[PDB]
Amino acid sequence: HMCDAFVGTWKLVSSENFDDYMKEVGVGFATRKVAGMAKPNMIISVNGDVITIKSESTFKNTEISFILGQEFDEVTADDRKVKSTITLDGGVLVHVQKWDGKSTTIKRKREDDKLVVECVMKGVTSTRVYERA
Ligand SMILES: Clc1ccc(Oc2ccccc2-c2nn[nH]n2)c(Cl)c1
Numbered sequence: 001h002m003c004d005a006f007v008g009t010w011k012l013v014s015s016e017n018f019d020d021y022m023k024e025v026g027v028g029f030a031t032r033k034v035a036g037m038a039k040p041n042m043i044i045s046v047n048g049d050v051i052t053i054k055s056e057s058t059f060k061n062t063e064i065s066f067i068l069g070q071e072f073d074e075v076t077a078d079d080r081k082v083k084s085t086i087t088l089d090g091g092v093l094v095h096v097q098k099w100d101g102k103s104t105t106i107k108r109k110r111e112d113d114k115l116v117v118e119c120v121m122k123g124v125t126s127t128r129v130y131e132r133a
Contacts, residue, residue: 002088009042010133012130017127021126024123034059068086071085074097092108104121107120
């Protein structure tokens with residue numbers, strides 16, 4: 001029942017500083033513009049030890065399935081091929097992505113009725129707020 005509070009169907013309702021975050025990641029102009037429009041839905045489910053996060057948008061659909069603490073390969077919406085490890089730290093899902101000698105951390109937490117996603121690349125944070133769909 002670990003991530004039970006994350007389970008469900010979520011829709012992006014607000015974003016802050018996402019363009020700057022993408023710039024810091026290395027996303028190019030066209031992908032930044034198109035990705036920045038999107039209002040993804042995220043579907044989170046758990047089956048035994050396997051957590052699945054599916055994201056659907058006009059731009060791209062993504063999907064990751066993983067076991068906490070166990071590194072896996074991930075294709076991001078901006079098409080990076082990364083090595084990802086996701087843990088739980090005090091009720092927060094902590095997701096580290098490594099590629100090309102770079103690293104970014106995405107933290108997901110429940111706050112009131114929202115699922116708040118903080119994406120950090122060096123000194124730059126973007127906050128992406130989801131509500132139940
Ligand atoms: Cl399908 C889909 C999935 C994620 C997306 O946005 C991102 C793109 C790059 C890095 C982080 C995020 C993000 N947004 N909320 N959580 N992570 C988009 Cl635009 C579309």
